[PDB]
Amino acid sequence: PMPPSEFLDKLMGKVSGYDARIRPNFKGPPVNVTCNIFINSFGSIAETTMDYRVNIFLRQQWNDPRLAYSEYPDDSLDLDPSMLDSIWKPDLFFANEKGANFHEVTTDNKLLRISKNGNVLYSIRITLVLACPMDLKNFPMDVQTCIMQLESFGYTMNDLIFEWDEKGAVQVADGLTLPQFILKEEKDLRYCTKHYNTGKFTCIEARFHLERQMGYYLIQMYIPSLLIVILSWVSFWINMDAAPARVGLGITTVLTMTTQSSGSRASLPKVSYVKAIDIWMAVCLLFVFSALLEYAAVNFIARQHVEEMRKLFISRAKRIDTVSRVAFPLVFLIFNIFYWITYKII
Amino acid sequence: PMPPSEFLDKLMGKVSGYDARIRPNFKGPPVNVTCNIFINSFGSIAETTMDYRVNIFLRQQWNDPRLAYSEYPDDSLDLDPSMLDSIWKPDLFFANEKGANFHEVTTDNKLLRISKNGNVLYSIRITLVLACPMDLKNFPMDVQTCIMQLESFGYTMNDLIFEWDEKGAVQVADGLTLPQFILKEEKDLRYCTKHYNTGKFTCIEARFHLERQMGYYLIQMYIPSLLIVILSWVSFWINMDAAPARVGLGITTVLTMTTQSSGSRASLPKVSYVKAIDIWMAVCLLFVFSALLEYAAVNFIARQHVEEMRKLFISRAKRIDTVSRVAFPLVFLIFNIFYWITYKII
Amino acid sequence: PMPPSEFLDKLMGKVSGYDARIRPNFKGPPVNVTCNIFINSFGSIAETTMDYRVNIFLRQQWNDPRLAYSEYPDDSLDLDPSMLDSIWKPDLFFANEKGANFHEVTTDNKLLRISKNGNVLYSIRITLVLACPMDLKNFPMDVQTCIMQLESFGYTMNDLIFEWDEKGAVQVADGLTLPQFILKEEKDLRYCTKHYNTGKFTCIEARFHLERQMGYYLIQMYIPSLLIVILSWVSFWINMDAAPARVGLGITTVLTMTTQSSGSRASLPKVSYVKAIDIWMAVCLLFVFSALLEYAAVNFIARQHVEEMRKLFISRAKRIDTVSRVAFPLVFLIFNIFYWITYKII
Amino acid sequence: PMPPSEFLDKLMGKVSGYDARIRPNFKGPPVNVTCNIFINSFGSIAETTMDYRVNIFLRQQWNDPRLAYSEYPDDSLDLDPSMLDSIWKPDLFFANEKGANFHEVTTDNKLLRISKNGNVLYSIRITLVLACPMDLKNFPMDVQTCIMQLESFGYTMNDLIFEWDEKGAVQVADGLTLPQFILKEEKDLRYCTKHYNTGKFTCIEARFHLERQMGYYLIQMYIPSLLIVILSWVSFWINMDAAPARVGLGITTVLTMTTQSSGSRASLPKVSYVKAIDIWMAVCLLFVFSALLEYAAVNFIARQHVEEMRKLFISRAKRIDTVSRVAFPLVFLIFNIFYWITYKII
Amino acid sequence: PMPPSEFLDKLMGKVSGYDARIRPNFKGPPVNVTCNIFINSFGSIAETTMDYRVNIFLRQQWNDPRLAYSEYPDDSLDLDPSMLDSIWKPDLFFANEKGANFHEVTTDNKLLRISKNGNVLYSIRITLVLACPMDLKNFPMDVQTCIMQLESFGYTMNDLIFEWDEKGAVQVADGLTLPQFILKEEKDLRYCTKHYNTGKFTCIEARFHLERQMGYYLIQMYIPSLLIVILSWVSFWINMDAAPARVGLGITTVLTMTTQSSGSRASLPKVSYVKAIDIWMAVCLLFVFSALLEYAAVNFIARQHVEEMRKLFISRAKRIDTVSRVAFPLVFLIFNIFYWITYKII
Numbered sequence A, B, C, D, E: 001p002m003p004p005s006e007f008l009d010k011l012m013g014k015v016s017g018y019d020a021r022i023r024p025n026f027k028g029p030p031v032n033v034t035c036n037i038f039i040n041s042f043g044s045i046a047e048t049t050m051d052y053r054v055n056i057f058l059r060q061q062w063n064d065p066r067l068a069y070s071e072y073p074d075d076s077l078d079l080d081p082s083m084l085d086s087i088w089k090p091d092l093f094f095a096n097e098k099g100a101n102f103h104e105v106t107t108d109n110k111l112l113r114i115s116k117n118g119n120v121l122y123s124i125r126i127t128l129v130l131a132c133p134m135d136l137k138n139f140p141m142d143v144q145t146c147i148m149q150l151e152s153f154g155y156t157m158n159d160l161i162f163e164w165d166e167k168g169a170v171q172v173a174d175g176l177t178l179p180q181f182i183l184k185e186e187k188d189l190r191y192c193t194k195h196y197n198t199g200k201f202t203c204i205e206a207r208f209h210l211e212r213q214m215g216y217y218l219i220q221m222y223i224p225s226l227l228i229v230i231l232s233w234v235s236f237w238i239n240m241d242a243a244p245a246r247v248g249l250g251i252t253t254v255l256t257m258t259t260q261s262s263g264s265r266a267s268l269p270k271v272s273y274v275k276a277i278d279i280w281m282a283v284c285l286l287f288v289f290s291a292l293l294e295y296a297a298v299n300f301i302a303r304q305h306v307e308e309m310r311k312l313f314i315s316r317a318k319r320i321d322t323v324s325r326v327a328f329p330l331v332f333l334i335f336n337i338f339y340w341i342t343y344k345i346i
């Protein structure tokens, strides 16, 4: 028996009329290409650019009746990746590519095998930098949905149809972890059939649900913003004689809170709307600033201190600074309920 | 009937005299190439570099009378993208490229189809990083106009003319959003015919109007600069005895305002002119600095306090600090009218 | 005798039936490819991306019985790297590539030599940017294990098996040093045989143990955080009359400690868990903040100063500020034992 | 008549002895190649790297007597850019390339036309990142001269000579603007003939004079450094009783001036010499620091206050603080004359 | 006479038995390739990556007796760079490449000429990004030695030997300057012959001595750290009554010194050892911190002030603050001698 590389030159040579520019079942039913991916690496999910980098094995399966053999004994024949220019292949591309490349280290990372009835398996390795728009309205508590979609470029719907296979259309590697996110296991699979003025082109897509890890933002930003509000509360047990101190405590804390609020969006997209980390920093900016205006209502209410009213204005100040030892640690805890319950129902 | 790949080798082979180096209608009327684009992705509009990255489908249509057939039955014939070196194609380029590339993932993302009368549709996928000069004179309220222009490189006006088609010359995708901008729907289309010393070359261009989203800059910079001015106003209800406090309030606020003014242009081009965020920060730098010079006109006007004039200088200070409890919250509101009305009329 | 380049065209030409698409020992036992690497450069170990860049010489050895000669006199024959498309080579790739390239400066950096019995040595130069997940739970005291794994792509286990050679399977260069890490000499070598739905593919891997250098983090972060805690201890020898000073010392130190705690993770991945530099900064944030609440328990306990109890409240404050001259330099040293012993046992 | 692509295969085919490896006028006078450029884009002038990115049309004109025809009727013949490997072209390169590339979007952006007497026009599009050393001794007021030089690589002076054409050797586009610089219209053109140990090679160069825009640095750095000096002058009208204030004004301003001086070189090369922004920041650092030492000469000269000398030391302090209300706003204005006149004469 | 391009096809064609895969003097003495470089550009010496970018002309000279001619009249023959695939060339590479590329703008920047006796000159243009480990123990005063080494890849020592030529083996361009360094003129040239398990391979290297420019670090870091120590010395002439001031001067200066010490290594590798800028910042951190503990030994030594000992404790404080007006400006000047003499002897 002749070896398979001299046998595939009989199937696909100038004899037997095989032509790699012509799809299987020409002037007939469309080619049913069935696809599944295997994610090796995932991550570097940037939000200034609103993209993410994935590293997949793209497997494609179709049927080519011109490649059906009956004389060679074994059930499968592998091509050299040097000879991939000699079969028909689907012109799959990604509708949100934003740059991608193959991998060509020590050999083209391409796989091709042909069964007896003409089933062709074609597996390649691609690195993609896919685009996904980020919905950052509830920013440390959001569930991002970033997609990837696989279209035909030249063949319309009456010539080539993509499908996901029903035997696990998206596999993920064994210990694939993410530093900021967790990848939920349920991955939605649906159609995205495009209509241009050239024609209608097939499309299938896969949704990936990315839920954040709140444990980072809870340490860097939610706790040090909770402490500086408590620095405003220690201004109330100091008497109304250390006016360089309680104003110096009402200023050094209200201006380091502006640093926390400006530093809370140092590596984010410049979005128009207000997000959930913003209505935490701006409300904690209000408590650190209303404790300064509390002292201006103490230093002025005792400045106006004819023998009873000048004693009445000393004890009026000693009552307005005993409500703020309760009202500010009780309004701030009502906000701690109406914030975390609000961003746990959604 | 022979298949179309063996039929296009009869139209474009060494027989029938077709030559891909010679334009249609040679030594005759010029080739009328009609163009339209389809924007898949838009954005990453940087202003240090003054560029933006677009991802388009570039469709070109012309007429090639040497490709008119009459024997094959179907109305259109697709080329393999492997055989694109064998037709004539227009040498379109972008006059403000600044780097660009094709997309070659799983197949060259190129489309080509030939009708019966010789109409050729040619659609490719390009990622561009186009250059546009930014007019940042009114910076959070500006309407940027960034263009893209499509020229011929080798053929002059008497050989090749570009046109926009009248059936929607610029299509935009379904949910194409931008993080900082909104893309207005009216897109201007006009001619940009170039004259060099080599000849005159055809050119068509498309204007994209990009209006910003003020909602980001309104949160990070316009509101925290509005608060620090109000920190200067709480210095007036404190009596003229806490001189370490009111000077400490006239210094910690006037030096965190320099941080806000220096941090207002941290990721901008170093433009010569003064912009609208600069005449907000510099005027709010004046109110936070004139409240310090108000106190120097209080601490010195009471320092000069022979029994009536030493009582006259105590109540003169208690009058200059009661005008500044009104005049500074009234001059700052006249500026709030003369700023936002000024940048809403233009 | 004819020269070896005209002798290798007799071994691998169209005569003698050699075919570079067919592995040695076809329809027989699998090819035993034995591998070893030589690390030229190592480092740029980033942790935002969780990757590292290595620069290796990849040596592969197998046996090809079709390349066994007996007539040429010398024992080895070198190929030109121009003629590397004419032998069989294993399709080795790296399962955590994340981008890689060859080196082609003045010549393809490729080596190939063929012995008399058919032993083929094949050595190439590769730059890899390999992926490794970082376990940063004990961050300046961790031992990172970053791997590299060498798989087949097209040939399954019944056709091609990778092995490490027993004569030093990983060599490292002479003076290969790292700025942040030390590379331990014991390098683990084990199998990583993959199972896909395509088949089972061979895999071998090498573990590199990277232990950090604590001497950098001990200078920038552990010592300046140890000083600011001692700034809180100098607040206790100042009497309870400099209330703008001891509050100004209880605020300027507790807000520069927030800068140290926010600046301790300026170039790190946003990990969910709490790490060993975080429970040093957050506990030293507690000592610099509990020295402020100590003074509020002094300024209020003397504010309540009918002739004995108003003398009893002056000396009660002079006792609570003599326990904090001992208890705070003794609780902080118990934490210095329970921190460094905790991160030296593991 | 045969078409020009079948006519240029008669001029440059295997017949008629044309050889693209042999220059025109071989073993004769040297080839006179005349050059001019057209700048499309200019800018991104970095100074850490000391480079700038230009985007040019490089036009070259020479005479090739082997390409002179007399039978074809028209006066010019265009080549396909596919056929540019078949003529002789000069091996022009840039002696300060630092990386460059062509542009190959929808067609090689190359132009070639041949007149009847053999005049060959050759125009290509190049993006360059050219190197220029920056003379930053007077940094916001400098006139940078950045060059570009065009050499031969293989042909010496007795075989190939470059010239600039006299009809406008450097054209600039219509609205080519720069964010930081202005490009002066007079562009110097001179020879730069190189002598190596291989031979002497031709070279022509073009100087571009880049004058900065002082209006950016005048807003971010020269005005906020002028204000903090005036903050030191408001310390003099405050009496010598607010010692926490005037020292707090002599410290918060002298340490925010160190931030201005360290932040004045945040994105600059680390040059050895002292530049004009440095002797503004260091002298304004002296005025903000000598107003602190003025107060130490007041707080100590009144501390020494036997009945006349203890009254003589109260009014001696009230005289040293009335010279500094004049001498510091008069020495600082003499420096404002001796700085701007010094950097306007040069 | 036939032209040289038709004469080099007689020397190197299929006739006369020339084969570009076989080195000169085969089965004889080794090929003596002699090398020299010409540095066009140098710099961008990063230390986070510990690399530097050079731009060289690499000249190689060897003898090929198969290229000796005697019939053509002229003494040298130039090859087209299109025909460089047809001679033998040495497989030189750089053992610390870390990425490199050729230059291919308007022509391959390659030069080749063949003399009558067979001497071959081969000059190419390479951009390298070479690796050098940085010894930063004395950081602003160090002399860095960064190397480049030129090895053979496929040919061992018994087939190919590299040498430096004795006529100026490293030339540097005319005005090649560096922003941070100066390149010393004496360049060491020595052998670096490698031994692998494949064989022994030739290697030559060139050392470049890079001495820094201290004038940058003397302005940004050594002088502003010298001023803040002098801010601690102005705390001593202020009396022991401005306790919010002298503590406010002992805190605002000791916490801006932590900013100077943390900002002194903002763009450096994270090295384990302590460097010369670190033992300047940490010792100046000690003087700014020991002036705070001096005041705690004044405010407590006067707090203990039965009629003589309560007068003895007032004048004891007025003596401990008169030693620190001398001892701190004398210990700091002994350190100024023992630092600069220590880093000038080495």
Ligand SMILES: *[C@@H]1O[C@H](CO)[C@@H](O[C@@H]2O[C@H](CO)[C@@H](O[C@@H]3O[C@H](CO)[C@@H](O)[C@H](O)[C@@H]3O)[C@H](O)[C@H]2NC(C)=O)[C@H](O)[C@H]1NC(C)=O
Pocket: A025, A029, A030, A031, A032, A161
């Ligand atoms: C690729 O898959 C598509 C399905 O998405 C196939 O299209 C469908 O094929 C059937 C034949 O099996 C067509 O005929 C239908 O048959 C049923 C009986 O099973 C009959 O009741 C219907 O009235 C109809 O005649 C069907 O029209 C067709 N549908 C479409 C939308 O094309 C296609 O045949 C597959 N092609 C290959 C090459 O496997």
Ligand SMILES: *[C@@H]1O[C@H](CO)[C@@H](O[C@@H]2O[C@H](CO)[C@@H](O[C@@H]3O[C@H](CO)[C@@H](O)[C@H](O)[C@@H]3O)[C@H](O)[C@H]2NC(C)=O)[C@H](O)[C@H]1NC(C)=O
Pocket: B025, B029, B030, B031, B032, B161
């Ligand atoms: C490509 O489109 C251009 C239009 O931009 C065509 O150019 C014009 O073609 C007409 C023929 O249809 C030329 O002749 C004119 O005809 C009118 C009658 O319709 C007559 O009244 C005029 O006096 C004139 O003879 C016209 O000169 C020409 N204009 C230009 C500026 O070239 C061109 O024919 C089209 N080419 C192809 C191949 O479709």
Ligand SMILES: *[C@@H]1O[C@H](CO)[C@@H](O[C@@H]2O[C@H](CO)[C@@H](O[C@@H]3O[C@H](CO)[C@@H](O)[C@H](O)[C@@H]3O)[C@H](O)[C@H]2NC(C)=O)[C@H](O)[C@H]1NC(C)=O
Pocket: C025, C029, C030, C031, C032, C161
């Ligand atoms: C490549 O290496 C593998 C080992 O990993 C070789 O596989 C083994 O080869 C032996 C023949 O030497 C096979 O036969 C066995 O021989 C022993 C006697 O030595 C006998 O007692 C056993 O019952 C068995 O018959 C063995 O089955 C085989 N093992 C596997 C898993 O394949 C292989 O031959 C090597 N190939 C080449 C081309 O060197």
Ligand SMILES: *[C@@H]1O[C@H](CO)[C@@H](O[C@@H]2O[C@H](CO)[C@@H](O[C@@H]3O[C@H](CO)[C@@H](O)[C@H](O)[C@@H]3O)[C@H](O)[C@H]2NC(C)=O)[C@H](O)[C@H]1NC(C)=O
Pocket: D025, D029, D030, D031, D032, D161
């Ligand atoms: C390319 O341009 C150069 C000029 O840079 C030409 O070189 C010069 O050519 C002239 C001939 O026109 C040579 O002869 C001289 O002629 C004058 C009369 O015009 C005579 O008085 C002189 O004594 C001399 O014989 C001249 O030597 C030569 N100069 C050099 C430096 O080569 C060159 O001919 C041009 N080549 C082509 C192909 O156009």
Ligand SMILES: *[C@@H]1O[C@H](CO)[C@@H](O[C@@H]2O[C@H](CO)[C@@H](O[C@@H]3O[C@H](CO)[C@@H](O)[C@H](O)[C@@H]3O)[C@H](O)[C@H]2NC(C)=O)[C@H](O)[C@H]1NC(C)=O
Pocket: E025, E029, E030, E031, E032, E161
């Ligand atoms: C390339 O250069 C090397 C030198 O590094 C040459 O190697 C040496 O060549 C000499 C012949 O000139 C060999 O023979 C010696 O000759 C002296 C007399 O001059 C004799 O006294 C010695 O006993 C010895 O026979 C010498 O062995 C050889 N050395 C080595 C290490 O190979 C080489 O010939 C040069 N090759 C070419 C092609 O130029």
